[PDB]
Amino acid sequence: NAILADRSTSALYVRVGEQLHPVLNLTSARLISGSPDNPTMVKTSEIDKFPRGNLLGIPGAPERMVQNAATDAEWTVCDAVGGANPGVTVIAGPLGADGERAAPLPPDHAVLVHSDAEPNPGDWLLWDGKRSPIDLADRAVTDALGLGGQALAPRPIAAGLFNAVPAAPALTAPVIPDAGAAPQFELSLPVPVGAVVVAYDADNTARYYAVLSDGLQPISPVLAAILRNTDSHGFAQPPRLGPDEVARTPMSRGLDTSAYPDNPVTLVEASAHPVTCAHWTKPSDAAESSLSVLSGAVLPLAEGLHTVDLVGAGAGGAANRVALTPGTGYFVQTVGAEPGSPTAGSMFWVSDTGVRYGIDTAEDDKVVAALGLSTSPLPVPWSVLSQFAAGPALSRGDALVA
Amino acid sequence: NAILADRSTSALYVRVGEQLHPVLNLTSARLISGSPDNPTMVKTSEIDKFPRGNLLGIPGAPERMVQNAATDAEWTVCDAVGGANPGVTVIAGPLGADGERAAPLPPDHAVLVHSDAEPNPGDWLLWDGKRSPIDLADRAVTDALGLGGQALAPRPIAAGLFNAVPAAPALTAPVIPDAGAAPQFELSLPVPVGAVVVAYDADNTARYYAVLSDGLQPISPVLAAILRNTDSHGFAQPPRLGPDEVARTPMSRGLDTSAYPDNPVTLVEASAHPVTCAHWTKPSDAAESSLSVLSGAVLPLAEGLHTVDLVGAGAGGAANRVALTPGTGYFVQTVGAEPGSPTAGSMFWVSDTGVRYGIDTAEDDKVVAALGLSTSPLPVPWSVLSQFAAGPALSRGDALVA
């Protein structure tokens, strides 16, 4: 005997014990039986011969446990502004998870952003890789970082996009213990420590280093402008030095890491390129995940998915359009950077609508087995997962309803 | 030649033209066929013999179209500050549509409230009938309306219940053209217009009536205290007349409305009684819908309905819980007091999850026919429907999806 549905009305029932029992939907039915089976169509002219109990079933949802065989974790969380430079823009926060049409970041491009309105603190800069806070009050520092002359108009952000990208340390010059003083490797006369040196190292021209107490620092031009804005040390220009002296001087870096760039930055325009996008990716056979930024004016979602840009509801999370094929189930690391309340390597199932469900440790392999999902679901971070809806729990216990 | 689900995978197809088409859910399949039918179970070893198109189907939802044959229009939209009486609570707005457990309103019981918690304009009061705005800074007026001695610690309120009940006219003393002056019917000497008179109409003692330029008004003692604190006209007390005089002087019944009450008011305490409720009922064979106010501390919905209750959040309408059996579809008045956008007697289908699904007129009887729903669904007001929200639209036209 399998689990049953009526020849006419498809009413959901199974006998357990010695008695029939109605339930709500077939996913809960498979959950009850602990088997991935289908309710076969037999008329109630059987059913009436058998004694029947009372109404059961975990309410709400879902209906089909399909899944796509793509084991590579593509994740596109995204934000689309529109109508650039009034105060507030028209909005999508879109979301897809597959290969997609191209609108990536060119390495010169990076973009300023206002934080999602204060007291969520700060004003931020979307980098090559990361986000890092910048007080844009000092114009000389950030145009010395390479902005265009007053091309500044920040954009509001979705909080999910803002939590999607990991954050970098802030944008000032680092505080240096007794800069301007003498280092402990002691070059020729005019140099103070914490300053910049220049040296002819191209056959045409020069490249740029800095001074700590130990030795030299291979730095960008941008860091040099940063420190000369920080302290000129009473000195106009750095002096050029010999490469034989460069080999002859202590080559040792006290590591003041450059998250600061190498280049002047192309500024993105929200009229010219509204949609800014975070491409989280952990492929199969990867030990640690990667992240890129995408940016364009075309919606970079995959072709054919624009017909099925499906909207959710319920701001406080997602007010959001999404687009996929029929739904899936993914291996959530609720062990992560504060994923709501739950903390485990767990599994969360997700609909084509995009409502979340999931699995405990007390929820065994019988759960996913009756759902018939793959033994290996997909790794997924939390900040993309916070843009979904939250349904009821899943267990064989919670289906026992009145 | 019907709806077809696979004997193993239950994949959904109906052949049209000459070819097959994969679709999403069986409700959309019935929508395609235009007939309420069932997915027949045949193997793919037939399917392969027939050429196949691309994927179609309305995304999202629903499963099936049941309906409960109670044609009585019972509706409960409720407010429950669970975690009784702090400023911030767990917000249930309960939505049953049936009979329920006892939560009355005794006629002395009527409940003060702030607006949708301040800065929303004004303070309000829930009456026997309706809600009415009142500024409560005039303490003498409202305790002259009959408050207890400083029992005022009013309530916050969700906007859903505040838009559930219609508003009554305002709550001050009415502006009277030349009150205190001379009438046109001219009683014995001391009387100003806008004054009150008593008579021993209870065979013990008095009963209270106000005056216009034409004659008399049957007023409450509450209204008498209202006009008394409005203007005493330098007079301490009403005079006494007799029924001989009540008829003999012209009982020329002018009218200024007594929406104001008849009695002192039992002020309800939200710690004693948190849940306050609106019983919108249009019975079968009704010309106009009745409305009551309900009140208590017990969650007043039907017995057994709380184990199958469904929780609620997600502002943009309901942040509010719901409770029913499997779902229904109603003859909703979008002919009402600003029903959002639609203006028709329009059918909205609604799940046990509580997602609305509107039906147009160009969406003809074929739609409800293929859904198999009854030709007489239930008249529903807008303000309870606003405590649902929309998934996709429903037609065979928009079911042509990629």
UniProtKB/Swiss-Prot annotation, chains A, B:
Cellular compartments annotated: Cell inner membrane
Lineage: superkingdom: Bacteria
Ranges in a coiled coil: none
Keywords: ATP-binding, Cell inner membrane, Cell membrane, Hydrolase, Membrane, Nucleotide-binding, Transmembrane, Transmembrane helix, Transport
Cell inner membrane is among the record's keywords: yes
EC number: 3.6.-.-
UniProt GO cellular component terms: extracellular region; plasma membrane
Keyword Flavoprotein listed: no
Family membership noted in the UniProt record: Belongs to the EccB family.
Protein name: ESX-3 secretion system ATPase EccB3
Naturally occurring in which organism (per UniProt): Mycolicibacterium smegmatis (strain ATCC 700084 / mc(2)155) (Mycobacterium smegmatis)
Part of the full-length chain shown: 100 to 501 of 518
